[PDB]
Design a protein around this ligand. Structure first.
Ligand SMILES: N[C@H]1CCN(S(=O)(=O)c2ccccc2)C1
Length: 165
């Protein structure tokens, strides 16, 4: 069974107006099989709108494409983003109770991306742990991967994870 197509599609912004379906495909096929690849154009002029979409056969291929950033396509560095995830670098992690420590969160989340800050929330008056935390990554794709997952188990706790603004 295939991963849902909606989780295999990347929005590609910042395109050169000279990029075509064919040149976009030729570039992004280097990181996987593309089941679809389109440059968005004006309906009347056919002039590029400066963005497009590529759909890979597997989520692993999406990951490979994102890990190969920065992508310079037809002379311009473009901006890939997962098209469906339901742009920030920070998550709320709730439900971690009082026994979850920084190393629990780091050991778990470091496989989603490079962590820059872990903030375990404590009570302003007592210093007791409040049972939630914030994790900041160096890049948004980590967060997009994280919030797409249905489940997050950290330190034996079933955690609620959301984007933090
Ligand atoms: N309930 C089904 C309906 C669609 N999917 S999905 O494509 O796996 C998905 C997962 C996470 C975020 C956005 C989409 C699950």
């Amino acid at each position: 069974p295939k991963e849902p197509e909606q989780l295999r599609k990347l929005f590609i912004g910042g395109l050169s107006f000279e990029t075509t379906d064919e040149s976009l495909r030729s570039h992004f096929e280097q990181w996987g099989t593309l089941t679809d690849c389109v440059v968005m154009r004006d309906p009347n002029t056919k002039r590029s709108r400066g963005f497009g979409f590529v759909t890979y056969a597997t989520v692993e291929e999406v990951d490979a494409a994102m890990n190969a950033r920065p992508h310079k396509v037809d002379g311009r560095v473009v901006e890939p983003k997962r098209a469906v995830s339901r742009t920030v670098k920070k998550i709320f992690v709730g439900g971690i109770k009082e026994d979850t420590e920084e190393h629990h969160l780091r050991d778990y989340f470091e496989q989603y991306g490079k962590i820059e800050v872990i903030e375990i929330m404590t009570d302003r008056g007592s210093g007791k742990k409040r049972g939630f935390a914030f994790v900041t990554f160096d890049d948004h794709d980590s967060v997009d991967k994280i919030v797409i997952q249905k489940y997050h188990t950290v330190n034996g706790h079933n955690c609620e994870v959301r984007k933090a603004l």
